Amino acid sequence: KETAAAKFERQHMDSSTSAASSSNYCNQMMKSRNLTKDRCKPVNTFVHESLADVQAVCSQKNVACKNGQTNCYQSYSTMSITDCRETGSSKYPNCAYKTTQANKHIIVACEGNPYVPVHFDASV
């Protein structure tokens, strides 16, 4: 099956573009990464950095995860991200998203050997 690390890359990594392409970015992207297949995932963040830069966050600032676990890490530098947020009019299977571009610190949870991101926790 798809590993947790690979699931993180599918859900959250878009190194192809420097920022949110367009107003239509989230609609195209949430569908193509299979985030609208079983339901409309209501919120999702994409990170526009190289994979190496994001994997490096697992050795940056250790912070508590929202769930109380302690394996979360906050990036020291801000990163280019896009938040995708379901619109009020969105109804499965025709999911619809607002696309918002931002530059924020990311918080990810890391596990494994090698120690890599498996969960996007928050942006701050």
CATH superfamily: Ribonuclease A-like domain
Number of domains: 1
CATH class division:
Alpha Beta
Indicate the structural class.
Answer: alpha+beta
Neighbour order of strands in the largest sheet: 2-3-6-7
The residue fraction in helices comes out at: 10-25%
**Given the C-alpha coordinates, what overall shape results?**
globular
Taking the sheet with the most strands, its summary is:
4 strands, antiparallel
Gyration radius over CA: 14 Å
- Order of helices and strands, N to C? HHEHEEEEEE
> Into which percentage range does the β-strand content fall?
25-35%
Named CATH architecture: Roll
CATH topology: P-30 Protein
GO molecular function: lyase activity; nucleic acid binding; ribonuclease A activity; RNA nuclease activity
Family: Belongs to the pancreatic ribonuclease family.
EC number: 4.6.1.18
Protein name: Ribonuclease pancreatic
Task: Tell me the layout of helices and strands.
Elements: H1 4-12, H2 25-32, E1 43-47, H3 51-55, E2 61-63, E3 72-74, E4 79-86, E5 97-104, E6 106-111, E7 116-123
Architecture overview:
It contains 3 helices and 7 strands. The protein has helices at residues 4-12, 25-32, 51-55; strands at residues 43-47, 61-63, 72-74, 79-86, 97-104, 106-111, 116-123. It has a single domain (1-124), classed as Roll (P-30 Protein). The longest helix is centred in the first third of the chain and has 9 residues, at 4-12. Strand 6 and strand 7 (116-123) form a beta hairpin. It is globular. It catalyses: an [RNA] containing cytidine + H2O = an [RNA]-3'-cytidine-3'-phosphate + a 5'-hydroxy-ribonucleotide-3'-[RNA]; an [RNA] containing uridine + H2O = an [RNA]-3'-uridine-3'-phosphate + a 5'-hydroxy-ribonucleotide-3'-[RNA].
